[PDB]
Every structure is written in C-alpha cells, then in structure tokens.
C-alpha cells in the first residue's frame, strides 16, 4: 500500500486509542 494512506492509518490508530 502507498505511503500516504499508511501513515494516515497509523495516525488513526493513535487517536482511536487515546
């Protein structure tokens, strides 16, 4: 998968769990 969507997915994981 492309780098742009992947980093936004990791950002989504941080904010969903805090």
């Amino acid at each position, epitope marked *: 998968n492309s*780098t*742009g969507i992947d*980093f*936004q997915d990791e*950002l989504d994981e*941080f*904010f969903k769990n805090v």
Partner: antibody
Amino acid sequence: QVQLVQSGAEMKKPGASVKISCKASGYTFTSDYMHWVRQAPGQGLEWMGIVNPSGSGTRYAQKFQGRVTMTRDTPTKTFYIELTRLKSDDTAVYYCASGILTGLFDYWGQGTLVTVSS
Amino acid sequence: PGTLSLSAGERATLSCRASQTMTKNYVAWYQQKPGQAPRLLIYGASTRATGIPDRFSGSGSGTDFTLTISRLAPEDFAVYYCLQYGSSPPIFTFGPGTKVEIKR
C-alpha cells in the same frame, strides 16, 4: 480544488491571546488531518500541532503545550488556533495546512502575520 | 547550515541528521521560495509528492537520510527543509533550512 483561506494579519500586545481562522473549500473537510505551522521572519519553519478529522483528537508540540488550543468545526469548515500568553518570540507568519494526501502538509493557507509587540 | 552555491545542471545532495533512526522511514523534504508557502517534494524517505519531477529523489536508512537533486533547473533554487515525523505519538520536527543559490 482544495483551498485554505486564513484570516487577516493581527497586532497584539505582550501577554494577550490571538485566534486565527482557516476556512476550507473544495472538499469535504471530513477526511484530513490539519496542522498549524509558523515561521518567524527570516527563520525556519516550526510545527505547532495536529488535529484529527473529527476534531476530537489533537497533539500539540511540547513547546506550546498548555498555551495553544486547536479546534475544528466541520459545519462551517473552519480550522482554528488559539495562542495565549503571547511574547515577542511569537511574532511569526502562521500557516494552516491540510494533510489530506499524506498526513503531512499537502496544501497550505496563504498565512497570517501575527506581530506581538508593545 | 552552510549555503550551497552551484550552477544549473549540477548535482546536490542534502543530508538530514536523524535522532533514533527517525522512525521506520519517516523523513520528508520541503522546498520554500521567498514570499511563498513550503511545498512538499518527498515523503516516506523516497516516494515523490504529486507534481514533483523525477530529478528530485530521496534515500537512506537508519539515522542517515538524503535528498538528491540530480540536476538543478533554474526553478529548483530555494531553501530546503528536512522534516522528521512519527505517528505514535504524532510529532513533526522541521530541520534547519539549507539555501541553494545560483553560482555566478
């Protein structure tokens, strides 16, 4: 086309607070992380914080923790920064930026000069 | 951050001094011209941003990351910034700018 339009230049005395707006257009405003970046005249860029698309999640740079506040209002498609306890060091051009493509800074506002001085 | 002087068509290689291997490969490069907003050129160490010519390129691993301009076009002369970032916790840290100027 994505377009970010910030409010106009501001003049503030030391110790006062400032609130810049950033109005988005051309897209849903519901997908993108947003950032605030500032640049003192003749100096480098400095990241300040990030806001998730819902606006319920933020993460400021540690230098501005406790004095900055970022908010978002999807129905008005407006992005806000609120800096307080202003010092002369805070004189800078402030940029809003959208991370719709990479999560970084893909689209920029025109910027807003904030001059803190007595 | 020493200024670079070179003629058009020359090669330049900018380096970024990472801390703790940045993270994964999270380094990006921004270009800014006077009176203008910064423009992203490279992110993820090596993948180009939209509308950025192939003459720009990025590479590196560990603490050593690099932006190469294989040949400078007249429009490539500007200040260039390294951006180190991460996701958990989110953080975004610009490096000092490096001006690239026309040798004469």
